[PDB]
Amino acid sequence: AGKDCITIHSATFAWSQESPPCLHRINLTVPQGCLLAVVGPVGAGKSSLLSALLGELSKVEGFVSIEGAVAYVPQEAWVQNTSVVENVCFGQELDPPWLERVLEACALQPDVDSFPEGIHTSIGEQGMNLSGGQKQRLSLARAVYRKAAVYLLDDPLAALDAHVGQHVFNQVIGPGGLLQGTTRILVTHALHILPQADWIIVLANGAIAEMGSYQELLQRKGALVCLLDQ
């Protein structure tokens, strides 16, 4: 097995110290360099699990340790009142060939050619209007550009069309992609990428119900199969 990257140890979380817990006693380590899929019904706590790893919830009990710099792609993206390149670099030092590769992998190179200023086109309030899919892919591109070691991905490709979502997942997130050496935690509502993940975590009511690979949880006729039938 690979080295321990994320360790979540007897960890219980809530929105406040006095609130009833929203995540119940997580006990989990993620190996370094893997793609972990987090699935479960609506309200099972998939999004709050990433927020808990961001340190945004109040930890009632337990301990969390994460090895390496962490990048986050929210479910609802938003872009700054600036140009395309300033949105991707976002303070990071500019490296043109790496920017081109990131834009390419995130299915943004056609969109950039169509813009008048190219990568220097203003977006946001004063800038040009973007679609929901373009903002979401610009959001993922910003996280990829940072070259973090851990990626928390709150179903960033959900609304995208079929072939563009395939382009982005295949080039960025999945096996062989730009993030292949990183530890990726991918919450996903759609379930066709599950055979490409290394491990699957199924959550129920803010707790872990099942963990295994795709074939493991499939031959097991349990929570993942029940959700696939749903």
Asked if residue 42 belongs to a known ligand binding site, the reply is yes
H/E stretch holding 91 reads none
Enumerate the β-bridge partners of residue 204. Answer: 207
Q: In what order do the strands lie in the sheet with 70-73?
A: 70-73, 150-154, 183-187, 35-39, 199-204, 207-212
Token readout for 14 is: 């809530």
H/E stretch holding 219 reads helix 214-219
With vertex at residue 178, the alpha carbon angle to CA 176 and CA 179, rounded to the nearest 5 degrees, is 90
Q: Among 182, 140, 178, 176, which Cα is nearest to 157's?
A: 140
Asked if residue 46 belongs to a known ligand binding site, the reply is yes
Asked if residue 187 belongs to a known ligand binding site, the reply is no
Asked if residue 47 belongs to a known ligand binding site, the reply is yes
Enumerate the β-bridge partners of residue 39. Answer: 202
Asked if residue 124 belongs to a known ligand binding site, the reply is no
91 Cβ neighbours under 8 A, 6+ residues apart: none
Taking a C-beta distance cutoff of 8 angstroms, is the pair 72, 110 a contact?
no
Distance CA 114, CA 100 (A): 15
Q: Kind of pairing, strands 4-14 and 122-123?
A: unpaired
Domains of the chain: 1-230 (3.40.50.300)
Asked if residue 2 belongs to a known ligand binding site, the reply is no
| Structure-determination technique | X-ray
